[PDB]
Symmetry: D2
Subunit: 341 residues, 4 copies
């Protein structure tokens, strides 16, 4: 009587998933969000007088990924599907640039949000249909991790998040994570609890701990390998309309505590969203968290698109401005990494 | 209290009434809209190749014996050679259109090939479109296996099928479609009828708890399970009376009587075996829900056998189609 | 190939089913005669009677020896003392009940205790030694059990909380399985209090959630629904609701919540009636029965106030015995026929 | 904001965390001296000593009066009598313990009972009266509790079934919450027996399912993990397994199963061991500690065999006190050093 090999992730894949997961959530570093859609790229390119063409998107993302030494501060890069199959102007596959900097490619694989019937606009995350085939293709193209956004909200008067909300989120997250790992992708698990409301931080801690207990029990039920998975929740914070906002030390305290109360330490890392300005509250919050411990999980940042805002402004679509632009990107990347510690 | 917490009185009434009509006394559901390939096996006994849908739909009086018809999506938008939409022909007969909306099966990772049913993505939009085109019920098939040595059906299997069914059902009702819930427990294996009874009760308990959690209106839903039987390689086959007994017991043990009907899958049985089993079930006193057995395949079969591929036999082909529809229908009374 | 020890035996299943069917008779009801020494002290004081064991025996003899009472009473709840007690003329109480075909039963829980770190939400205690108690009670002639679980409705405080529901359903399932392991019919009692100003739609919602969880739990614990009974509260508005539901509304919602959650294998559903034929509960169950035939039998578990006028008529003095019994006989009668 | 009644207070949380941290000391272990009157009657009969309260008191006093014992002992399990016992010089046993910094605790469950219609799978009884017992125990000086749950592994029979796991988790979480509501640290004890021929991978799989369920339930019942301790079996092959695991494998899978399921807020995990320094468990725990620093402390809860040599050195002779204590001391020392 033994466990069948078909019931476990193989040695090869478990080692790959663990190694990649560990590299992606590096404390010195962060994930570059370079996955704007055509529609979002239009707004950005417009701000600098650049025409939104496929070729120019290739110029822009070559500008990002070919920045010499970026991998010292950037652990991974989120790509739009177009970019995953795209070559630079000089003929170099985007994934090859990333590889040259040791930056790990990833991609969003969900199909967005849909209201759960008979809830007060509480949301399910869709995308399981054809997800395995997508993950296979993506891995073959060079992606090594996935994203999948789930959303919960807090509203005590309306009983949010309802049981159904939490059940759905946990199930979707677990299915998506197992499917990812079946296709050799590290899943980034993302139960995002919105800050909408005037609840204070203790409420957010309570909700967070309940949601995370549920999510990890679900991950265990679906045979998800925590050693090859990552967690990206919101930090534990007061609601945006709370009249008594938490301090950075408090946010650090409650976030570390919720994680330690619910996250098994087999999970190698927990990441949080930062808007990529080194002085912003998310930086301060994470720095305060790192002052504590050290922890059973690596802490790291997933950077919003604004990280490369100045890079864009420096470049302006002008070839001659590449070096300058890339210099700027480095200094932002470095400074955000350093701000964590 | 509150507004968007409940199904409206209007919609709940429509769903309840349509579920009632679908699971009507003395009637069955016609399953004769079939694909290109699957009618090669069907044709090659009658030996014609390539109107048929017209032959099925233009059969006057069929509503007496047929409560619903299963259509493909394309058929919903299709018109008669006289410009009449197929769904308007079905409507004139009082026959309710329905459609299978799941996207088939996919292995649950790290299980021994137990299956998730796929198809929630875009499902709500599809359902809205189908209602607009005239569909009033939907069908979703989940599959589970029995294998005591391998712990099948596993907790993950049961959990996934219950989740997918409840999700599907809630979405259907959100788009004014009656959901037909089909948790199919395969008869593979050597287990006897007591094992199937035990598993069926566990599965249906999980499924109806999930349906409650997802706010599914039972009054506007329908259940389509296998009858409870011995496994196909079982050395001690169950009698008709035993099948009746354990099937009725499993249902009474797990299914709230707000559900208007239970319409059994053919499950690999003969038409007359299924008829006999249902008869033994009817012997077992009045039930809180309508019980039906499936026979669309047999109807389509004998109609095709009458047709033989010649345009001359149309009338005859329709007459027998009515006759058999009657015989099967009245067998359920 | 399922195995013997995984299911209630045929004989015991038959016994449980038959006793359950008998307990939930439509024209009849359960007599609540299980006053504690203290309660019975109170309303013995109400008629100037010294609360002694002998006088309690007099009183319950007077109840259970009413000739014909079995036409309107299907079961009787006893205090433990009474289960082992003889009438003053030497007849075992259970023998008196058996002569009238009245089935004896008894409460087996040990009351309520707050769930830690909840807002005063309650677990029902009583599982320790419960099996042994049921065995002995059966041995003494008991054939059904009672176990009160409590939940509250409070939207502002998220009540009933998931932990409340989970605890109640676990404890109920546990209790019921043990009962049946000792050949007792368990009366499953998830009582949802009427505290609050919520209207009837809120109570219907909560009742349906709670009952769904309860019956899933009963299934998880291998409980035989065929040999069990349910006694919930009727679905109603809150005691402080400004817009109260009507009798017809109450019937509609109660029947609907049951049909939406209770599997038909369950042979009966009982409700609390205060023992008067004209009160709200009677009219409610009446509207319920007017609403066509049901998968479950509907019945009444009468409160200790039913035999009150019998006690007033008795006044402890022996000469009134017959008289007292007459009163009882009519009372039950009036309460029986009113259900249908 | 969150209600203060929804959380363990700062003072109590701090007390629980500190006591838990002290109990799960890596260089130490828990002394088990909670024999009942019968058990101690057997152990005394082994060395020709009359089993009286006087002699029991002498024995307990000899154990707990060992000066310096607090170096290798962080806790002591007492039988209820011992908690209220005094030395011949009138010093409370718990005060002797306090002087050595050794923390007292007590087993509070009421043993196992078969879950109905299971193949003799066991529920743990003891929740009735548990809160009151815990309050009294704390008042007498108790600071931790023990509660043993038992599961088995049998693939052909589908053990541990869902009901077994569900029950174990429910009982453990209720008990944990009640302890913490009375300021006791609960040691949570989901014991998975080694009966069977399965190999270590099966045990690991089962352990991970069981622990996942236990910890979800601990969360559902608002159990403060910072003030709790876990005491599972090590992950090993079954006792009849033909292909036994190595010490390194046992360490690997045990550590893995814990890291896969146990949140790092839990200060420590303790395993069961005999009083033998070079026994399997000691080498296993040793192999575990070598696997770098862990998110929780690893420790030992010793069996009643630890003091067997002390008990034998005593010989019931008062003059033999001083030496016997040395025998315990040494016997403790090795056991502490064989862990790290």
């Amino acid at each position: 009587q033994t466990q069948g090999p078909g019931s476990m992730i193989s040695q090869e894949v478990a080692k790959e998933l663990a190694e990649n997961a560990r590299k992606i959530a590096a404390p010195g570093k962060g994930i570059l969000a370079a996955d704007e859609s055509t529609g979002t790229i239009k707004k950005r390119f417009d701000s600098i007088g650049v025409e939104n063409t496929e070729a120019n998107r290739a110029f822009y993302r070559d500008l990002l990924f070919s920045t010499k030494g970026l991998g010292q501060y950037i652990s991974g890069a989120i790509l739009f599907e177009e970019t995953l199959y795209q070559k630079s102007p000089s003929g170099v596959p985007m994934v090859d640039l990333l590889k040259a900097e040791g930056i790990i490619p990833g991609i969003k694989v969900d199909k967005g949000l849909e209201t759960l019937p008979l809830t007060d606009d509480e949301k399910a995350t869709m995308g399981l249909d054809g997800l395995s085939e997508r993950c296979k293709k993506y891995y073959e193209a060079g992606a090594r991790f996935a994203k999948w956004r789930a959303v919960l909200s807090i509203d005590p008067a309306k009983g949010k998040p309802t049981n159904l909300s939490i059940t759905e989120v946990a199930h979707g997250l677990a299915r998506y994570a197992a499917i990812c790992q079946a296709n050799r992708l590290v899943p980034i698990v993302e139960p995002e609890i919105l800050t909408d409301g005037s609840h204070d931080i203790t409420v957010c801690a309570e909700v967070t701990e309940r949601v995370l207990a549920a999510v990890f029990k679900a991950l265990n039920d679906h045979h998800v390998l925590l050693e090859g998975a990552l967690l990206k929740p919101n930090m534990v914070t007061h609601g945006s309309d709370c009249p008594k906002p938490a301090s950075h030390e408090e946010i650090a305290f409650y976030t570390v505590r919720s994680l330690k109360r619910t996250v098994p330490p087999a999970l190698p890392g927990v990441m949080f969203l930062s808007g990529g300005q080194s002085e912003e509250d998310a930086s301060l919050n994470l720095n305060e968290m790192n002052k504590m411990g050290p922890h059973p999980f690596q802490l790291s940042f997933s950077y919003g698109r604004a990280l490369q805002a100045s890079c864009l402004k420096a470049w302006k679509g002008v070839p001659e401005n590449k070096a300058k632009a890339q210099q700027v990107l480095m200094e932002r990347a470095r400074a955000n990494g350093e701000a964590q510690l």
